[PDB]
């Protein structure tokens, strides 16, 4: 029911909040990584490998040759497919209780996939860019 408002900053994840795998996969890519750079290897990657079931599934020396673009490919590689699979099998509440989910894609979780943005402090520049405008017009939005 909680649909995150649509900001001027076209965040990643205003475009894959509706499936949380997508959007926590984005924030895997984006971990310490130049967006202008993991973009463009994220909606590849998401091509080839749409779903959790098909992520965790995956071969890993496939995945990193994808992944050459970034550099520490085998590294990504293994932990996109962990989380896929932790994801899918792991009982979890947050999604920080999951291999390879820190505090930005908790943090990018709480704000778009359920709504708790109110609760919290983002630590990431754009994240801080979305959160602060949303707090600036959630009057005038029609929200939290």
Same mark, same amino acid.
């Given at each position: 029911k909680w649909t995150p408002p649509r900001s &001027?900053? !076209?965040?990643v994840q205003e475009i894959l909040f509706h499936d949380p795998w997508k959007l926590l996969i984005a924030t895997i890519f984006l971990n310490r990584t130049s967006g202008k750079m993991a973009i463009p290897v994220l909606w590849e990657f998401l091509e080839k490998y749409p779903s959790a079931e098909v992520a965790r599934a995956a071969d890993w020396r496939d995945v990193s040759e994808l992944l050459k673009?970034?550099?520490l490919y085998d590294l990504r590689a293994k932990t996109i497919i962990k989380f896929s699979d932790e994801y899918l099998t792991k009982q979890w509440?947050? &999604? #920080?209780?999951?291999?390879? #989910?820190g505090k930005y894609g908790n943090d990018s979780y709480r704000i778009f996939?359920? !709504?708790?943005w109110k609760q919290v402090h983002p630590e990431d520049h754009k994240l801080n860019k979305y959160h602060d405008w949303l707090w600036e017009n959630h009057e005038k939005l029609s929200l939290s």
């Amino acid at each position: 029911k909680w649909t995150p408002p649509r900001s &001027p900053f !076209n965040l990643v994840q205003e475009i894959l909040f509706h499936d949380p795998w997508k959007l926590l996969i984005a924030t895997i890519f984006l971990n310490r990584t130049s967006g202008k750079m993991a973009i463009p290897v994220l909606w590849e990657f998401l091509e080839k490998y749409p779903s959790a079931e098909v992520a965790r599934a995956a071969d890993w020396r496939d995945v990193s040759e994808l992944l050459k673009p970034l550099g520490l490919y085998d590294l990504r590689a293994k932990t996109i497919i962990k989380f896929s699979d932790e994801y899918l099998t792991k009982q979890w509440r947050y &999604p #920080i209780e999951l291999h390879g #989910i820190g505090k930005y894609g908790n943090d990018s979780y709480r704000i778009f996939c359920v !709504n708790e943005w109110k609760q919290v402090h983002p630590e990431d520049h754009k994240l801080n860019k979305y959160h602060d405008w949303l707090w600036e017009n959630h009057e005038k939005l029609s929200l939290s």
